[PDB]
Design a protein around this motif. Sequence first.
Motif, short mmCIF file in Angstrom:
data_model
loop_
_atom_site.label_atom_id
_atom_site.label_comp_id
_atom_site.label_asym_id
_atom_site.label_seq_id
_atom_site.Cartn_x
_atom_site.Cartn_y
_atom_site.Cartn_z
N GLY A 11 0.80 -1.22 0.00
CA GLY A 11 0.00 0.00 0.00
C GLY A 11 0.83 1.26 0.00
N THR A 12 0.21 2.34 0.47
CA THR A 12 0.81 3.67 0.42
C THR A 12 2.21 3.67 1.02
N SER A 13 2.32 3.14 2.23
CA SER A 13 3.57 3.12 2.97
C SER A 13 4.46 1.95 2.58
N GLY A 14 3.86 0.76 2.45
CA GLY A 14 4.63 -0.46 2.18
C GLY A 14 5.43 -0.39 0.89
N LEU A 32 3.98 -8.59 -0.02
CA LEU A 32 2.73 -9.35 0.03
C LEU A 32 1.56 -8.38 -0.07
N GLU A 33 0.69 -8.59 -1.05
CA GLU A 33 -0.47 -7.72 -1.21
C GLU A 33 -1.73 -8.54 -1.40
N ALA A 34 -2.74 -8.27 -0.58
CA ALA A 34 -4.00 -8.99 -0.63
C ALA A 34 -4.79 -8.74 -1.92
N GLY A 85 -2.70 0.29 -2.38
CA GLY A 85 -3.52 0.48 -1.20
C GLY A 85 -4.54 1.60 -1.32
N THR A 86 -4.68 2.37 -0.26
CA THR A 86 -5.73 3.36 -0.19
C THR A 86 -5.45 4.57 -1.10
N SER A 87 -4.20 4.72 -1.52
CA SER A 87 -3.85 5.78 -2.47
C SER A 87 -4.54 5.59 -3.82
N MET A 92 -7.02 12.20 -3.61
CA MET A 92 -5.84 12.75 -4.29
C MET A 92 -5.30 14.07 -3.72
N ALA A 93 -5.90 14.59 -2.65
CA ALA A 93 -5.38 15.86 -2.10
C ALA A 93 -4.00 15.68 -1.47
N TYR A 94 -3.09 16.62 -1.73
CA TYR A 94 -1.74 16.59 -1.18
C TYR A 94 -1.53 17.76 -0.23
N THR A 231 -2.81 -12.99 1.08
CA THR A 231 -3.09 -12.43 2.39
C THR A 231 -2.12 -12.95 3.45
N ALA A 232 -1.48 -12.03 4.17
CA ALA A 232 -0.69 -12.37 5.35
C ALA A 232 -1.62 -12.56 6.53
N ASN A 233 -1.53 -13.71 7.19
CA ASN A 233 -2.38 -13.98 8.35
C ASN A 233 -1.75 -13.52 9.66
N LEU A 546 -3.58 12.40 4.74
CA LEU A 546 -2.52 11.53 5.26
C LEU A 546 -1.41 11.10 4.32
N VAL A 547 -1.64 10.94 3.01
CA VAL A 547 -0.58 10.28 2.23
C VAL A 547 0.75 11.02 2.24
N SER A 548 0.72 12.35 2.20
CA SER A 548 1.97 13.10 2.16
C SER A 548 2.87 12.70 3.34
C1 LIG Z 1 -12.04 7.37 0.49
C2 LIG Z 1 -10.74 7.91 1.04
C3 LIG Z 1 -10.34 9.19 0.67
C4 LIG Z 1 -9.14 9.72 1.14
N1 LIG Z 1 -8.75 10.98 0.70
C5 LIG Z 1 -7.41 11.32 0.84
C6 LIG Z 1 -6.83 12.38 0.13
O1 LIG Z 1 -7.45 13.08 -0.68
N2 LIG Z 1 -5.49 12.64 0.34
C7 LIG Z 1 -4.72 11.92 1.23
O2 LIG Z 1 -3.54 12.23 1.38
N3 LIG Z 1 -5.26 10.89 1.95
C8 LIG Z 1 -6.59 10.60 1.75
N4 LIG Z 1 -7.12 9.54 2.45
C9 LIG Z 1 -6.23 8.84 3.44
C10 LIG Z 1 -5.06 8.08 2.83
O3 LIG Z 1 -5.36 7.69 1.49
C11 LIG Z 1 -4.76 6.85 3.68
O4 LIG Z 1 -4.62 7.28 5.02
C12 LIG Z 1 -3.47 6.16 3.27
O5 LIG Z 1 -3.54 5.79 1.91
C13 LIG Z 1 -3.20 4.93 4.15
O6 LIG Z 1 -1.93 4.41 3.86
P1 LIG Z 1 -1.36 3.12 4.64
O7 LIG Z 1 0.00 2.82 4.12
O8 LIG Z 1 -1.51 3.32 6.11
O9 LIG Z 1 -2.38 1.93 4.26
P2 LIG Z 1 -2.97 1.42 2.86
O10 LIG Z 1 -2.64 2.33 1.73
O11 LIG Z 1 -4.42 1.14 3.08
O12 LIG Z 1 -2.18 0.06 2.58
C14 LIG Z 1 -2.40 -1.17 3.25
C15 LIG Z 1 -2.20 -2.27 2.20
O13 LIG Z 1 -2.20 -3.53 2.85
C16 LIG Z 1 -3.03 -4.44 2.14
N5 LIG Z 1 -3.43 -5.44 3.12
C17 LIG Z 1 -4.27 -5.29 4.18
N6 LIG Z 1 -4.31 -6.42 4.92
C18 LIG Z 1 -3.45 -7.29 4.32
C19 LIG Z 1 -3.07 -8.59 4.62
N7 LIG Z 1 -3.43 -9.19 5.75
N8 LIG Z 1 -2.15 -9.22 3.81
C20 LIG Z 1 -1.62 -8.59 2.70
N9 LIG Z 1 -2.00 -7.30 2.38
C21 LIG Z 1 -2.89 -6.69 3.20
C22 LIG Z 1 -4.12 -3.57 1.57
O14 LIG Z 1 -4.83 -4.21 0.53
C23 LIG Z 1 -3.34 -2.32 1.17
O15 LIG Z 1 -2.84 -2.35 -0.16
C24 LIG Z 1 -8.32 8.98 2.01
C25 LIG Z 1 -8.74 7.69 2.37
C26 LIG Z 1 -9.94 7.15 1.90
C27 LIG Z 1 -10.35 5.76 2.31
#
Ligand SMILES: Cc1cc2nc3c(=O)[nH]c(=O)nc-3n(C[C@H](O)[C@H](O)[C@H](O)COP(=O)(O)OP(=O)(O)OC[C@H]3O[C@@H](n4cnc5c(N)ncnc54)[C@H](O)[C@@H]3O)c2cc1C
Length: 565
Positions: A11-14, A32-34, A85-87, A92-94, A231-233, A546-548
């Motif tokens: 995801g975003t961080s990984g 590992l990505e689900a 991930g959630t990105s 898309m706001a930065y 999926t990582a358990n 959050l993403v920034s």
């Molecule tokens: C609808 C929405 C709008 C948003 N709007 C914005 C915005 O405009 N700008 C902004 O900066 N932020 C925004 N945010 C917040 C931001 O996008 C998230 O906070 C950020 O992307 C989270 O990053 P992360 O690395 O913590 O997790 P994620 O990006 O969610 O990554 C986690 C990854 O782990 C995977 N995963 C989960 N469980 C498992 C498992 N057990 N095994 C293997 N893989 C697994 C997931 O599929 C995912 O790819 C928004 C969020 C949402 C939901």
Amino acid sequence: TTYDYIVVGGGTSGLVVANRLSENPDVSVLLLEAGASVFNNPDVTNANGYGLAFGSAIDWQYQSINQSYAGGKQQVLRAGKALGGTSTINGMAYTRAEDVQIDVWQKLGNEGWTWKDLLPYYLKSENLTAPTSSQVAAGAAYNPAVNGKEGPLKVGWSGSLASGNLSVALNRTFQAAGVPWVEDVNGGKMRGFNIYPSTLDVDLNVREDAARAYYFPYDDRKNLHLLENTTANRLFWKNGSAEEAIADGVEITSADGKVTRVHAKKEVIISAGALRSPLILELSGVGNPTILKKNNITPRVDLPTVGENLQDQFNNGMAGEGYGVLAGASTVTYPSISDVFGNETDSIVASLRSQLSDYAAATVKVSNGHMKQEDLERLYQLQFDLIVKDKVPIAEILFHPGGGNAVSSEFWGLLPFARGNIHISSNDPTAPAAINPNYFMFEWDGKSQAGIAKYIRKILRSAPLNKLIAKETKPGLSEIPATAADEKWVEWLKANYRSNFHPVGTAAMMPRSIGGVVDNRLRVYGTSNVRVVDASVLPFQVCGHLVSTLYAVAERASDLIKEDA
Ligand SMILES: Cc1cc2nc3c(=O)[nH]c(=O)nc-3n(C[C@H](O)[C@H](O)[C@H](O)COP(=O)(O)OP(=O)(O)OC[C@H]3O[C@@H](n4cnc5c(N)ncnc54)[C@H](O)[C@@H]3O)c2cc1C
């Protein structure tokens, strides 16, 4: 099946961690990505597609428990199930954070985490495309000193951006309310009105998600490996004689249902998001022994604040109707407490001050006593001081042309005090978690939201914006009359809110002695070689999107991991 590093969650961080660790050709990295690639998913790539993917196969659609302080209804908690991930599904706001609120991380005991220490990593992550002359005329601006030019994450403004009456009127109206235009909200001082940039590839006119930024341009690396639909358990541990837990590897379930193992020679990095990483820890025996024992899991590490300290925001929306067509830039305003409350600020502050110890006492119980009264009082004091003394923004207020005569506003209190938790509901790795953000738990959280809504109502009827706006349509004066008491506002907000999908804190970076889950190098307490690198580790909420900040944190974490190697 042995690699140097396993990164759980692409995801975003990984993806940042996997990118940076695989820069060393002699180091092997398994992601590992689900979910799977969304490179070719047009609802992801669509530069104007925010919202389209909600409820689709790439939205996890997690669900909260009954929100007992907010009227009782459960809430969807959206998250991306996809490479990136959630990105891939976000707005898309930065925008970043207030300098002093990152400085608080070091204040509370996280050595090396300050605005000045994090800024180089924000820069490292970013490649900003300067606005064109037409975008400048619309209000687009930046401070070159605080924007990167070479990072993987492309940032910029829409090709559709053009000047229009609405954004000009908002600029003037906010200035008259004492909140001026600022050229850049990303230099550590967020207060003001701004034509904010987005995570957008302007060369291609597509969403710039984390995978397009940090993965695909690098996917020819032979030392970088990806398992999609995997999926990582839980983690499993080396069997030795010492107390400190050493992760041996990760148990995975593939799309065909087969359960197997992968092994890490160096470290396991958990980046599954704030709503999954703490669960992976619990299933691995790292967490609160009472919860683990209820689920027949033997604790490997007694760390009872895993899943505690969940902090999220909630948003609401308002709308207006123009006499004629409204057009222009999408804008953000970040007002302080005194901007929102004006002459009632002192009374609001006095009330909040009188409530902090009582908030702490309530939160002690949320955590079943695993966060202490004294510790929570001090954490809440830090947040209070940011709001009251440092005057950090207390709201985000977005204004959008809604097409035709419509204008919409989306807004949220930035720093509610409510804390909740997330915990496994079973030892079954497919079982939905019990997720409880405790929205509206504390008076401030609702009172500030209502103050922001009232402020927006005022803005809509203030000069010169009131020359463009005929009336408020949501809630409107029928639903909430001019003379309605605050309870009418709070009731309406509770009936209409959404999660803002900014959960943090479920594996919080704080000293272990104040209830932290990870140290200042993102290492899980009681382990030698497990880290969490995602929103779980943020110890407090931040003011911006959050993403920034997550990219910056993951960039810095990557350097710390390399140093330790
Ligand atoms: C609808 C929405 C709008 C948003 N709007 C914005 C915005 O405009 N700008 C902004 O900066 N932020 C925004 N945010 C917040 C931001 O996008 C998230 O906070 C950020 O992307 C989270 O990053 P992360 O690395 O913590 O997790 P994620 O990006 O969610 O990554 C986690 C990854 O782990 C995977 N995963 C989960 N469980 C498992 C498992 N057990 N095994 C293997 N893989 C697994 C997931 O599929 C995912 O790819 C928004 C969020 C949402 C939901």
